[PDB]
Amino acid sequence: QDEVIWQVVGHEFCSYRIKGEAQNFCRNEYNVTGLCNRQSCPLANSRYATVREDNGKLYLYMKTIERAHFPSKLWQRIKLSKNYAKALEQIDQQLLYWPGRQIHRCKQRLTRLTQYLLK
């Protein structure tokens, strides 16, 4: 079923997919890499995590297989407002067991957002 979703949305129309002439960018509000791919596909992965920026505050999102039918409680929010290091250990801790290799990607994403926040 998760593969059905990817075969429907990945290669064709998707509101978070931005195809230009040779490449795919994924702006989806719950992705980390920024690119379109099942491994990183937020909608087609039932267990997946992300970080995004908001008003000087970092946010980590997670979602599971249990709450798929209820979009309202489907995604889970946590807020971060501390320095980078501690913000790193939070993602490390929150993901040392959950995604598999998203730990490094969201460390990279948290990196870029904190440079945004200082600027």
């Binding site: 980078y84 490094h104 460390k107 990279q108 994403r109 990196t111 870029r112 440079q115």
Partner: protein
Amino acid sequence: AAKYYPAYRENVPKKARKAVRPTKLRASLAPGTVCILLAGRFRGKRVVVLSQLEDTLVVTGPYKVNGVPIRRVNHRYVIATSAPKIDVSGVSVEKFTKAYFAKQKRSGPVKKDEAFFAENAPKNALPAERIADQKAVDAKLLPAIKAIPNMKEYLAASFALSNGDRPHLMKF
């Protein structure tokens, strides 16, 4: 660990197998040889080789003869001559190293000024120890070229090519 990691997994270069081995200089560039400088500000000067450094030759035509201080000169920019050898066994050559001739580190794009050019110069910059070393090597080198005739003024002169001279036929 670190702060603000790059968003790109760094590409470490493959382990190179290029081992540095000592340079085998030309068999005719023995210490004490009279050589001809081909490039640089002292092109055409005749100099006396002191020692062979890692890549170049630590060389000076006696500063009281032709005014060429102690310099490194790359071995590809000298024509070694067949002139009689000068005794350079009695002069210390261990203190002439890459560190000795090394320039001051800059690591920045800012440079150049009229006062900068007014700086350096022989009057400034030039250490008293460097002057003393030049005088000491002069004291140890002049007696040999005084003893063998015509070599003092030979070192003073400047090499030049004339009409009809063909360097492949000519030997030095």
